């Protein structure tokens, strides 16, 4: 009964380890969706600022 009980103690530890790895993968995937949205906002912000620089440059041309 002894080796059986110790093997079971080991399985319990390995299940804890496994479940933490599974959780880590899920959380990283979810957070990746947020990073996708941050990156989208940043790309559009960059574009708006580039357009603004270009338009103020043109206004100077059209003075001038």
């Amino acid at each position: 009964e002894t080796r059986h009980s110790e093997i079971i103690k080991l399985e319990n530890s390995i299940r804890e380890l496994h479940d933490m790895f599974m959780d880590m993968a899920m959380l990283v995937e979810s957070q990746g969706e947020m990073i996708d949205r941050i990156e989208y906002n940043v790309e559009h912000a960059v574009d708006y600022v580039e357009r603004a620089v270009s338009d103020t440059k043109k206004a100077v041309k059209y003075q001038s």
Binding site: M20, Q31, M34, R37, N41, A45, Y48, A52
Partner: protein, 58 residues
Amino acid sequence: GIEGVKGAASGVVGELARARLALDERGQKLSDLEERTAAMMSSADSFSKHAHEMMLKY
């Protein structure tokens, strides 16, 4: 061994728990960053509209 393997598993659980705690912080920081970049984007959008209107007057 069984004790040696159990020890190695415990060891990994501890190291991974530290990484999990750091991943929780990253999530909190990312939620904050999403708000900050959404606000930065809105400002950029408005500035672009006004620069465009300005250009079209001359």
